Design a protein around this nucleic acid. Sequence first.
RNA 1: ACCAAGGGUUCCAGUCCAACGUUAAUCGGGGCUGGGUGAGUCGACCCCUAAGGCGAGGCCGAAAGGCGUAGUCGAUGGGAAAAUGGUUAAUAUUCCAUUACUUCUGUGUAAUGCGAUGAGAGGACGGAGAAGGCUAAAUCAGCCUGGCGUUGGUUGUCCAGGUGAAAGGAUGUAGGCAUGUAUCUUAGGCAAAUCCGGGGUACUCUAUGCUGAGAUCUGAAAGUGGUUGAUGCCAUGCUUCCAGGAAAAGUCUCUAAGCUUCAGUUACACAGGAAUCGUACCCGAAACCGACACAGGUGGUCAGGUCGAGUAGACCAAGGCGCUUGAGAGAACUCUGCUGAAGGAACUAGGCAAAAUGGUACCGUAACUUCGGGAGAAGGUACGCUGUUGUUGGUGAUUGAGCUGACGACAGCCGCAGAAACCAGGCCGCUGCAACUGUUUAUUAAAAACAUAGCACUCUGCAAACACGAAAGUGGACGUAUAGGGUGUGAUGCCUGCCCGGUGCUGGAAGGUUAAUUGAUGGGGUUA
RNA 2: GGGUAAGUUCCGACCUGCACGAAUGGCAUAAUGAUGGCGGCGCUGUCUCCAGCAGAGGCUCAGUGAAAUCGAAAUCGCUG
RNA 3: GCGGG
RNA 4: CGCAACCA
Lengths: 272, 44
Amino acid sequence: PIQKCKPTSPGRRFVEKVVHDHLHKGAPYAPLVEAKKRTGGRNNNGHITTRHVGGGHKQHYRIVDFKRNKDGVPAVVERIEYDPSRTAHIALLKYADGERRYIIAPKGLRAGDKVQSGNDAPIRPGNCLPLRNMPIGSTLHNVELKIGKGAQLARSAGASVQLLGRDGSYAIIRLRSGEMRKVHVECRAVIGEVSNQENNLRSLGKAGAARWRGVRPTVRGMAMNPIDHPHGGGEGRNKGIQPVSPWGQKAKGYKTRTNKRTTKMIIRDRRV
Amino acid sequence: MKRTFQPSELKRKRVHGFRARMATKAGRQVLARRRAKGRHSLTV
RNA sequence: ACCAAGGGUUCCAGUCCAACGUUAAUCGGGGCUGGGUGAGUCGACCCCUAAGGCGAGGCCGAAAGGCGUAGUCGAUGGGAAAAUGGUUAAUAUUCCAUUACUUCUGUGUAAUGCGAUGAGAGGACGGAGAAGGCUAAAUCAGCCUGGCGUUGGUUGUCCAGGUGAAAGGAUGUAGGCAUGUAUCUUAGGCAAAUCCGGGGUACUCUAUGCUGAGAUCUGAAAGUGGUUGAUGCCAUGCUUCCAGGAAAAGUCUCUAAGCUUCAGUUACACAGGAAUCGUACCCGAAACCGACACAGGUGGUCAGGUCGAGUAGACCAAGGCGCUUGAGAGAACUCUGCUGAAGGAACUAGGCAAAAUGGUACCGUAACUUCGGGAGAAGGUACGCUGUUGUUGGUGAUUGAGCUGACGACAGCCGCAGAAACCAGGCCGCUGCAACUGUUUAUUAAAAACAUAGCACUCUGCAAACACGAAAGUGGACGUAUAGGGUGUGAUGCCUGCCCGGUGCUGGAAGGUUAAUUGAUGGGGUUA
RNA sequence: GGGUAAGUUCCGACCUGCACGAAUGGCAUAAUGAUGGCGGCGCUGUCUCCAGCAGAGGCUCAGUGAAAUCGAAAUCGCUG
RNA sequence: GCGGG
RNA sequence: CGCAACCA
Ligand SMILES: [Mg+2]
Ligand SMILES: [Mg+2]
Ligand SMILES: [Mg+2]
Ligand SMILES: [Mg+2]
Ligand SMILES: [Mg+2]
Ligand SMILES: [Mg+2]
Ligand SMILES: [Mg+2]
Ligand SMILES: [Mg+2]
Ligand SMILES: [Mg+2]
Ligand SMILES: [Mg+2]
Ligand SMILES: [Mg+2]
Ligand SMILES: [Mg+2]
Ligand SMILES: [Mg+2]
Ligand SMILES: [Mg+2]
Ligand SMILES: [Mg+2]
Ligand SMILES: [Mg+2]
Ligand SMILES: [Mg+2]
Ligand SMILES: [Mg+2]
Ligand SMILES: [Mg+2]
Ligand SMILES: [Mg+2]
Ligand SMILES: [Mg+2]
Ligand SMILES: [Mg+2]
Ligand SMILES: [Mg+2]
Ligand SMILES: [Mg+2]
Ligand SMILES: [Mg+2]
Ligand SMILES: [Mg+2]
Ligand SMILES: [Mg+2]
Ligand SMILES: [Mg+2]
Ligand SMILES: [Mg+2]
Ligand SMILES: [Mg+2]
Ligand SMILES: [Mg+2]
Ligand SMILES: [Mg+2]
Ligand SMILES: [Mg+2]
Ligand SMILES: [Mg+2]
Ligand SMILES: [Mg+2]
Ligand SMILES: [Mg+2]
Ligand SMILES: [Mg+2]
Ligand SMILES: [Mg+2]
Ligand SMILES: [Mg+2]
Ligand SMILES: [Mg+2]
């Protein structure tokens, strides 16, 4: 779980690290990793399009099987592994015919456990099933939105959705944001909650720890000049302005959703 | 002090070289202008 | 001292001195004439790819053009192979001698399945730390040669100089890693596979393989031992931590296709090849970047002795230099230092600057504290040389010699002073601000400014919000609400009261007002 | 009130807050700071009040040889 | 110029 | 009292 560090120096006083004794200490499965170069938040044109991005440790991308399209074949868990690209752990499945794959690890999955996919799969954490065959009230993760595309929803370290009920060709689920949504019943989900789940109790402790994760420092617009930010200027400390983004969009409460194409799939949003 | 020039021949040829000028419309207009002036060196 | 970059003949020799050289110059990086750079193994070229670039088609765009697929380029990274000695005025891992190694060709001989653009393996990789085994190197000894000292002594336990052949071949150790072998089988590997992956059996795990420094053997006038000992090597190893650590080819396995008694493959033998370009010289520099033969800047490599923790420092070696105006004099004044009676901050905006402290071991050390600190708090003692005596460690000739490390106890001797020179913290009390390490006005501001971990609010359901872009599209993110963006605050402790009238924002939609649109009415003009 | 012989600064109080005040955060806070203020021990040429000495310039000789400026100059004081 | 008082 | 029309 969480281990607090002794204050043997000022940069250690507040470092709360997450420690897991069951994670594989060793190299990732080599056929399933590829290179992942850093962007710095720069697009095609070479412009910065996302601020506060840059640096960080070199990372390989693990190829996680989000589609789980190997149905009917049982698989056994070989090990649980650190994945630098996400906040959850990953499980290395060895299928019954020798194929090795990566999946998002469920909360209680350990080495030696068995998972399966398809319509026939038993109700068991790590089993991928269409939303038709899931029992109401179940805790799911790794939920599809389009048929055949792969898990898109509830993938982060402690995520999960509630299956609230199916009516027609749409199951109604509740998301972590507090939002009630409908998803086609041919979409697949996985049983259980996502693995890591104390990822949000950690404490970085020092600035350099944030730099290791590829985050660059944030500068307040209050600290800038008027040519740089709409909050800039002023003798001394002044913020005589309704808070706003660097490009002039209001920052407290102003809603920015403008997609009209999928609004009929939202039963109840958050803030209700 | 460190001064601004700091030579490197590869970088010179990749920024201001003949093939770098010939690769765009504006660089070929540079070459046409320097031929119109009668320069003895077209490029670096 | 040697490279890269950059320079471009400055390199070497002969000759000349007008100009250039902050003076003269017979000299020169100056003038004139001539010479000089030798490669299968060094580097580049070459094969391979990263970031990025270009990009057939394609998508987008008034045009110009933009993005991008297939591909094709692009090193700062991956991919064959050489050492020792000698030689020029100037080149040498290139020339010569000796001894190697790599990879190609052919021409044969003997054996017989060869296999791709496909699949697999491998190449293939982080930080930190530690133990060991070694070796270079250094030093001493041994040996060879010479010497017998301008002044007391010096035929020795004396002085000085010289003196340890590498790559490669064989061997396969210290260490490191993997249990291996056989057989049957198989929802996987775009199709095939005898291959890889997955299953099952039997024996093995005091077993097999791979890898591997160094030693030994060989190479091959003195030319042999000890000690210390690497940052080099084993080691791309091992342990541990989290922030989780290139790619592709060369290489190996497998079959597809295609051939088939051939071709191809592999074992050996014979003969022959390995092109092209660079190679001089300069490298804290008078040759590069600074207008200069300019106190600046310039990446990597090597780096000996005494003492020393040390690549600090003092003095030296190898090597290289005396910095391209000198000669006098020895005024004020300026700069840079040294010392200074008595006093000791009275100076001054201000102890500014100077003076002072300073090492090692041991003793001792307050408030306060987030229990880690504070703290080297403060402060104090000892320290040289000579001899005597003890414990101990490491190597290991022949159990233990010789060499060598560490720690003490006594006794004496000398000086003003034993940390001897160089080197090398000043300290304490109260208080504001910012938690802290960091960052910043290149060139008058380093801070209380910025950032920060932490906190909160808010937006965002994924073709996400948001940003860039004319669009295509790209980033966000090969992420998915424990995520991502914006805003403020700023560790931590204790906390964070009241106000929704104003301006925002969010929700509501009864009513008023209200655009394009539509075109009912009414009015006019024309005249049969 | 303390500190000094003597304190517009400093520290501790008081509250009459011209015109503090709670995430443009309030009040504290160990550690940290080439941070601001004040005090002390040591130490001193900072000073009373400067003296001597060393090196480098200055000065003289030989050689080379600038610069800014400049209407023209036979370019004194005082009072007006 | 359209509604309200 | 509000909403909307303003080019001597
Ligand atoms: Mg951000
Ligand atoms: Mg500012
Ligand atoms: Mg503005
Ligand atoms: Mg103000
Ligand atoms: Mg010469
Ligand atoms: Mg001359
Ligand atoms: Mg010459
Ligand atoms: Mg393009
Ligand atoms: Mg085209
Ligand atoms: Mg290429
Ligand atoms: Mg290279
Ligand atoms: Mg030479
Ligand atoms: Mg490492
Ligand atoms: Mg004599
Ligand atoms: Mg070539
Ligand atoms: Mg040379
Ligand atoms: Mg030098
Ligand atoms: Mg200059
Ligand atoms: Mg000179
Ligand atoms: Mg210079
Ligand atoms: Mg030195
Ligand atoms: Mg005195
Ligand atoms: Mg005195
Ligand atoms: Mg005074
Ligand atoms: Mg005074
Ligand atoms: Mg001072
Ligand atoms: Mg001093
Ligand atoms: Mg600070
Ligand atoms: Mg600092
Ligand atoms: Mg700076
Ligand atoms: Mg400045
Ligand atoms: Mg400054
Ligand atoms: Mg602030
Ligand atoms: Mg705070
Ligand atoms: Mg005072
Ligand atoms: Mg305030
Ligand atoms: Mg408040
Ligand atoms: Mg506030
Ligand atoms: Mg005083
Ligand atoms: Mg006169």
